[PDB]
Design a binder for this molecule. Sequence first.
Ligand code: BCL
Ligand SMILES: CC[C@H]1c2cc3[nH]c4c(c3C)C(=O)[C@H](C(=O)OC)c4c3nc(cc4[nH]c(cc(n2)[C@@H]1C)c(C(C)=O)c4C)[C@@H](C)[C@@H]3CCC(=O)OC/C=C(\C)CCC[C@H](C)CCC[C@H](C)CCCC(C)C
Ligand SMILES: CC[C@H]1c2cc3[nH]c4c(c3C)C(=O)[C@H](C(=O)OC)c4c3nc(cc4[nH]c(cc(n2)[C@@H]1C)c(C(C)=O)c4C)[C@@H](C)[C@@H]3CCC(=O)OC/C=C(\C)CCC[C@H](C)CCC[C@H](C)CCCC(C)C
Ligand SMILES: COC(C)(C)C/C=C/C(C)=C/C=C/C(C)=C/C=C/C(C)=C/C=C/C=C(C)/C=C/C=C(\C)CC/C=C(\C)CCC=C(C)C
Ligand SMILES: COC(C)(C)C/C=C/C(C)=C/C=C/C(C)=C/C=C/C(C)=C/C=C/C=C(C)/C=C/C=C(\C)CC/C=C(\C)CCC=C(C)C
Ligand SMILES: COC(C)(C)C/C=C/C(C)=C/C=C/C(C)=C/C=C/C(C)=C/C=C/C=C(C)/C=C/C=C(\C)CC/C=C(\C)CCC=C(C)C
Ligand SMILES: COC(C)(C)C/C=C/C(C)=C/C=C/C(C)=C/C=C/C(C)=C/C=C/C=C(C)/C=C/C=C(\C)CC/C=C(\C)CCC=C(C)C
Ligand SMILES: COC(C)(C)C/C=C/C(C)=C/C=C/C(C)=C/C=C/C(C)=C/C=C\C=C(C)\C=C\C=C(/C)CC/C=C(\C)CCC=C(C)C
Ligand SMILES: CCCCCCCCCCCCO[C@@H]1O[C@H](CO)[C@@H](O[C@H]2O[C@H](CO)[C@@H](O)[C@H](O)[C@H]2O)[C@H](O)[C@H]1O
Ligand SMILES: [Fe+3]
Lengths: 248, 281, 43, 45, 43, 43, 43, 54, 45, 54, 54, 54, 54, 306
Amino acid sequence: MVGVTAFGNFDLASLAIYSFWIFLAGLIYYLQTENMREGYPLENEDGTPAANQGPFPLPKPKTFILPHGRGTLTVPGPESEDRPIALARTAVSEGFPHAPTGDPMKDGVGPASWVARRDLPELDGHGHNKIKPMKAAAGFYVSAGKNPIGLPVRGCDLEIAGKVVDIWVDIPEQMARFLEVELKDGSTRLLPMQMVKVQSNRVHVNALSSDLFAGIPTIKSPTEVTLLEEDKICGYVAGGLMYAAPKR
Amino acid sequence: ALLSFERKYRVPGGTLVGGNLFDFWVGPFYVGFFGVATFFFAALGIILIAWSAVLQGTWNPQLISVYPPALEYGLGGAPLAKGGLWQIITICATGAFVSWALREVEICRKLGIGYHIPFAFAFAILAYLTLVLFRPVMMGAWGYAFPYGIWTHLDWVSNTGYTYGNFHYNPAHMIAITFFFTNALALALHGALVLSAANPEKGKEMRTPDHEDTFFRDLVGYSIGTLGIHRLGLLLSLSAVFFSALCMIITGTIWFDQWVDWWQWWVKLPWWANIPGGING
Amino acid sequence: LGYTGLTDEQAQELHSVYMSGLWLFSAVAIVAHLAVYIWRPWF
Amino acid sequence: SDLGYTGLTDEQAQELHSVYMSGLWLFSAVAIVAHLAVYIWRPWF
Amino acid sequence: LGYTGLTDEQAQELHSVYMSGLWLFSAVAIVAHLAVYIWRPWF
Amino acid sequence: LGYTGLTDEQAQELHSVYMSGLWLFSAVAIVAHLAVYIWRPWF
Amino acid sequence: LGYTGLTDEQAQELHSVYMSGLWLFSAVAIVAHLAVYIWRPWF
Amino acid sequence: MSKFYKIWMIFDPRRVFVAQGVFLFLLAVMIHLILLSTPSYNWLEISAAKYNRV
Amino acid sequence: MSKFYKIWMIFDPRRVFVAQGVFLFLLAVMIHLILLSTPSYNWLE
Amino acid sequence: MSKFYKIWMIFDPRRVFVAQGVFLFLLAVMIHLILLSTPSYNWLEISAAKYNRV
Amino acid sequence: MSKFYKIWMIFDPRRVFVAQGVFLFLLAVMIHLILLSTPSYNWLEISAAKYNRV
Amino acid sequence: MSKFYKIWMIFDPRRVFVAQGVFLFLLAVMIHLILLSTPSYNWLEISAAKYNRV
Amino acid sequence: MSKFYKIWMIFDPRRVFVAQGVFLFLLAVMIHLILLSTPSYNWLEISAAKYNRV
Amino acid sequence: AEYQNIFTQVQVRGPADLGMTEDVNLANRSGVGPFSTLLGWFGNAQLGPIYLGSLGVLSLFSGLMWFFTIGIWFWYQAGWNPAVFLRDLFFFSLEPPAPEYGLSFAAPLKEGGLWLIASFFMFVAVWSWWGRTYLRAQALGMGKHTAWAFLSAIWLWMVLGFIRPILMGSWSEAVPYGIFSHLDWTNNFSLVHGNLFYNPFHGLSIAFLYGSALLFAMHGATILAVSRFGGERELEQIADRGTAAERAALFWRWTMGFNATMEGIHRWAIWMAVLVTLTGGIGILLSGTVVDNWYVWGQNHGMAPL
Ligand code: BCL
Ligand SMILES: CC[C@H]1c2cc3[nH]c4c(c3C)C(=O)[C@H](C(=O)OC)c4c3nc(cc4[nH]c(cc(n2)[C@@H]1C)c(C(C)=O)c4C)[C@@H](C)[C@@H]3CCC(=O)OC/C=C(\C)CCC[C@H](C)CCC[C@H](C)CCCC(C)C
Ligand SMILES: CC[C@H]1c2cc3[nH]c4c(c3C)C(=O)[C@H](C(=O)OC)c4c3nc(cc4[nH]c(cc(n2)[C@@H]1C)c(C(C)=O)c4C)[C@@H](C)[C@@H]3CCC(=O)OC/C=C(\C)CCC[C@H](C)CCC[C@H](C)CCCC(C)C
Ligand SMILES: COC(C)(C)C/C=C/C(C)=C/C=C/C(C)=C/C=C/C(C)=C/C=C/C=C(C)/C=C/C=C(\C)CC/C=C(\C)CCC=C(C)C
Ligand SMILES: COC(C)(C)C/C=C/C(C)=C/C=C/C(C)=C/C=C/C(C)=C/C=C/C=C(C)/C=C/C=C(\C)CC/C=C(\C)CCC=C(C)C
Ligand SMILES: COC(C)(C)C/C=C/C(C)=C/C=C/C(C)=C/C=C/C(C)=C/C=C/C=C(C)/C=C/C=C(\C)CC/C=C(\C)CCC=C(C)C
Ligand SMILES: COC(C)(C)C/C=C/C(C)=C/C=C/C(C)=C/C=C/C(C)=C/C=C/C=C(C)/C=C/C=C(\C)CC/C=C(\C)CCC=C(C)C
Ligand SMILES: COC(C)(C)C/C=C/C(C)=C/C=C/C(C)=C/C=C/C(C)=C/C=C\C=C(C)\C=C\C=C(/C)CC/C=C(\C)CCC=C(C)C
Ligand SMILES: CCCCCCCCCCCCO[C@@H]1O[C@H](CO)[C@@H](O[C@H]2O[C@H](CO)[C@@H](O)[C@H](O)[C@H]2O)[C@H](O)[C@H]1O
Ligand SMILES: [Fe+3]
């Protein structure tokens, strides 16, 4: 039985607890610095570097090697929003909202914002397209639930906006990703599965009204979707929650 | 002041109450109406705890304790020096937690994301309320609720558990513990798997989720998936807290004996209740 | 300088009003403290 | 660069510091008044 | 190498101001130490 | 060599000024140790 | 074997300076051990 | 005190007013509760004792 | 009290009235409960 | 000493003012609470013992 | 010795100053608390002893 | 001996300096606390005993 | 043993230096605390007994 | 009324995914098992394939021997009575040898030897499974984070069953193999060492178990809330930050004042989880070997009134 104290009340338990406080301080520093590889250095609302950068310095850069010859990403690195953000500030001082200049859902700001991702399709471990339509997906079929092929699609304004013609599937994860909806104009749109509500007789889309499925961004190739395209589509649909409220 | 991508998201709207009066940011924080409510409640509670430290006569943060009123005060107020400070800190904390969840709802609405986070926090708040409000109300005294001290709410846990013997034998307690342990295991596995895919051995290309699925199918023959793992983590945490609240709501109100005796119903089933041998027989 | 966007005359006027409110508050506080002091002195 | 992380110039910084020092001296003088008052009422030394 | 991006003269000026602040702080500290020690020495 | 991207001249200057700071610290430490060992020796 | 990339010549001077530090450290350690053993031996 | 008005060229009133209201109400509640906690200045209990209401 | 009208140049009344009503009602409830807590004014025995 | 104004060429006045306002308020409330803790300097306690109001 | 300006070629002044402010305040508070916990150097208690304030 | 400057060819001066500062502060605080925890060397208590403070 | 320098061919010097430094410091404090634990080597208490400090 | 993304509403099945053959001996990998629609409502519907190498079969057979040894002891305790076996299943216990045997291996089978046999089997099974996790990570070229995260839990397990019994000088200190039995052991361990609540490392371990629950709720809820932007595909968000990662970061930035990245949140996760068992093992190692009454230690270290 140890328990001899070297001084005061400082036995081995005290040594251990103070050692753990030191280790925890170091670990929290390490975790916080490792979580500053994106979004830094901090910027003023005009995009210039801010005077206050915080107690934690930025970490040393590290490079990820992308898996299909897609390149190399070094973080933290230079950061620039490669798109024309259409907002104007509502106050000269900091910490106030920036109002849209025009149509926010169309311009892609606020809840409708999208990020200028790489304009290439997501590639699985075999280098093929990860997300592809069920038609091109060999041997892929609906296993459970109501198969939503030909179900009318209802918007938040409670009117039919089109019919589902296909399901886009993530091949390795073997899960549904997008519904392809053909509108009244004969053109096609993609809708994320997370924002549709498949039901007994119809696919409900609470995010968008009927007169908004035309505004959904399209895919240049009809049998594939790139990261940028799906980012734009998902941003549009999600922004419909705030910006289609006036309709419903 | 802002992240490099933050500006295109700081648009007006999404506010539950107000809309311009409290629709702005202080530093990084979004200040809604519920932001003001939360800040006031938190500051009042913290300075009241400091005041109770002054009253108690100790400046040790570990020794500071704010006991609820004694049992003879019932469900009524008490002098600030005796039991009233606890009740004020309790209403302050309840308001702070609820307004924090509502502020989260406002932030979710502004960002156009789901409301999962405030819902989970609501589970946590409901467990807290079970411990401070619902159970003491059903037992008719604020004195059953735990004190607000670092090492004295542990004494509350100890005394409350030992009132019923070994508290391990509460079956809902067993289920909640299973969920808690499973959740910690799953969190370790998820962090490890994502980090191992994103940090391959040495100068190797970053791994795809196919490699994650392959790793876990190789290991245990199943892979719940990238979406399934986050569903599982959320459900494990929420079920853990739900069964914690359930186990405490039935203790002292539906069950009053030693919890171990509750298991006798299995050993007394008539077909085998009187077979000699084993442990109970 | 020049953060909030208010000009010098606007700041002057706003601060004059704000100091008026501060002094109204302080005078009512003085009357309250005088009443308490004549009722129960703390010194 | 020490030529200003905040973007202020020497004149703006000097004037802002003058007003801040005036406020600090006001606060410190009121504090000295309070300290002398309490010490005469009940000294700690 | 120089990581802060300062110039040598900017570092000189910043150091002079900082050392002035440090010497003022240490002077007030020395005054406090002398006062306490003559009042109640610890040696 | 060539791990922090420093050259011999700046590394030498940095080392010299660091050694100067270290010797200042050590001299003050030795003064404190002499004072204590005079006041209450531990050997 | 570019395991570290050192050119087989940097490693020489690196080892020499590290050995200098090691010998200084061990020499002070030996002096300390002699002093404590003289003060009261542990054998 | 002449140039203190320039504080309103540093801070937007829409945030300083919210901060000031929160602060003053909080300080008021803290002081009132501190007085009510000590029996010496608990006005309700002083009144209960004076008027033999216990 | 003359110039205090400029306060509506700063804050939108359509929200300020709601916020102030919430505040005053909660202050009322706090005072009611505080008098309840002391035994010499609890009117709900 | 004369060049201390350059502190504002390194630190943003809004951040500094908020920080030192919170710091001074917390320091003052902590010192007052420390005094209220000590019996020899709790002004309320000294007053109540001065006028036999217990 | 006088050539210690070059630290500012190395360390960012803003982080150094905020860290030093925190360090100085915490060191001062710790030393004041060490004295307050010592009966022979608690100034408030020494005053209470010399002026019979108990 | 004289070649030790190569330490700055391997390790970033910023990391070394901050690590050394933290280490020295913690070591000094620990040693002062050890000496303050032994009545043989607690200079506060020693000076209390020297002048009959208690 | 002459060719021992080739160890830096395989081992990264930064890792070895940091690991060895932390290991030596931890070993040193462990031995100092072991000595402080044994009253036969607590130099503080040895001096206390020798000079009748307590 | 809105889809919360808790259960998939349409399941899709394609050809069986055999996985990535980085360095995996395809001989050891079994065939793809069945597809479970019940499991598919929540995650992947596919079962298997499972890899079975040297360490896999070693661990599987060693664990089978451990489980079978405990079960046969339980059957013996039931008097070979299936009704008694079902009635007292949770009450049976394979107990370690009595304290008078110390660490010796000369205890009778009924009084501790069978516990030693089962303990050896469990030791082999767990360490072979650890090596198996390391090797499966290595075969796919991934990092070894799973192995070290497992090593933390292995350290708590080793302290409980192996290291602390050796330090305390007897196998009787270790944990019995039984459902209610090891709960009784836990409660008695707390009682003997004087309210383990006052063990600082028990307190930290609980802090981190609560923190793991908090953090996995936060992370799962955050990813589900941004799954409408493909947020659950976290690796691509690490490689090419989309609007899901930005919205998650900004949610927690505007709520807490600070945030994580898609990659660093998993560092938070792994450390929060491993600290549970790391701190817990330290505390259990200290209990008895250094401190035998944690309440008195608490009192002497603040934490409790004298
Ligand atoms: C009356 C009981 C005592 C008490 C006595 C103890 C004792 C004794 C211990 C704890 C420990 C802990 N206590 Mg406690 N504890 C009490 C009250 C609490 C309360 C509460 C609110 O009251 C909580 C939340 C906790 C929580 C905790 C955890 C933080 C900690 C357990 C960590 C863990 O995950 O181990 C679970 C994980 C493991 C044991 C490791 C598992 C890894 C191995 C390798 C698994 C292999 C599986 C095996 C081979 C079988 C395979 C199965 C098949 C493959 C399917 N205690 C009271 C005061 N507590 C433990 C601790 O960490 O101490 C500080 C511990 O030893
Ligand atoms: C339901 C699953 C788990 C969970 C989930 C969860 N917790 C959450 C969230 C979620 C999803 C948030 O979004 C929210 C958050 O913002 O996280 C960073 C939060 C949060 N969970 C927190 C803590 C927390 N969660 C816990 C538990 C859990 N949280 C569950 C296990 C615990 C435990 C088990 O002890 C703690 C300590 C906070 C970090 C944060 C909520 C912050 C908040 O409410 O802010 C407003 C309030 C304050 C700033 C403080 C108010 C202080 C009072 C006025 C005075 C003190 C009162 C208190 C009762 C004293 C206690 C004394 C002693 C008991 C110590
Ligand atoms: C960071 C700490 C947390 C943690 C982490 C953690 N655990 C881990 C890991 C990690 C990181 C792994 O990598 C490893 C793993 O593989 O996870 C899936 C593991 C693991 N943690 C496990 C359990 C576990 N972890 C726990 C706790 C925790 N784990 C902590 C909370 C607990 C608790 C709370 O008690 C348990 C019970 C396992 C799932 C696994 C280690 C598996 C192992 O060692 O297996 C050995 C096998 C046996 C001893 C049992 C054999 C049983 C059978 C008889 C085998 C034969 C079966 C037969 C062949 C079937 C035939 C079928 C056909 C007939 C159809
Ligand atoms: C438990 O152990 C105890 C506590 C008992 C004993 C242990 C004690 C220990 C370990 C003590 C350690 C003490 C130390 C290391 C103290 C260090 C103190 C220092 C370094 C204080 C420095 C103070 C410096 C100050 C106050 C400088 C202020 C400067 C200004 C206010 C001016 C700033 C403005 C500038 C620089 C503008 C310039 C800008 C341009 C662009 C030129
Ligand atoms: C439980 O055991 C106990 C604690 C009782 C006993 C154990 C004791 C132990 C283990 C003690 C260990 C002690 C050690 C290892 C102490 C080492 C102390 C050292 C190495 C201190 C070094 C201090 C160095 C200082 C203060 C250097 C300061 C340097 C400067 C200020 C120079 C500034 C740098 C500049 C200007 C670089 C800019 C130049 C250019 C060209 C940019
Ligand atoms: C529990 O068991 C107990 C503790 C009771 C007994 C067990 C004791 C044990 C197991 C002791 C183990 C002792 C061992 C293995 C000690 C190993 C010592 C070694 C390897 C020492 C080597 C040291 C090298 C040193 C200290 C180098 C020092 C350098 C300086 C002091 C000057 C700084 C210059 C450097 C670092 C080189 C600069 C040049 C460049 C290019 C960086
Ligand atoms: C536990 O230990 C105890 C507490 C017992 C003892 C320990 C005590 C300690 C450690 C105390 C430490 C005290 C310290 C460091 C106090 C420092 C106080 C300072 C630096 C106060 C400074 C105050 C400055 C003030 C109040 C200035 C106010 C200025 C104004 C109100 C004017 C507004 C400013 C404007 C308008 C700027 C000009 C704007 C333009 C556009 C030109
Ligand atoms: C019909 O049923 C049949 C018979 C077919 C199968 C049924 C089986 C049954 C009923 C199995 C029941 C199993 C149970 C109840 C298992 C419970 C296990 C529990 C709760 C274990 C809990 C903790 C165990 C720990 C902490 C073990 C730690 C062990 C170590 C750390 C390694 C120990 C190694 C030692 C002591 C040294 C061994 C080495 C030698 C050379 C003896
Ligand atoms: C929080 C992390 C930072 C911790 C401080 C940095 C140094 C790390 C090592 C510190 C180790 C010594 O830490 C110090 O140990 C002594 C041992 O009696 C403790 O003990 C001292 O204070 C306590 C509490 O008043 C007394 O009951 C005790 O008699 C007295 O000796 C100190 O309270 C503690 O501060
Ligand atoms: Fe994740």
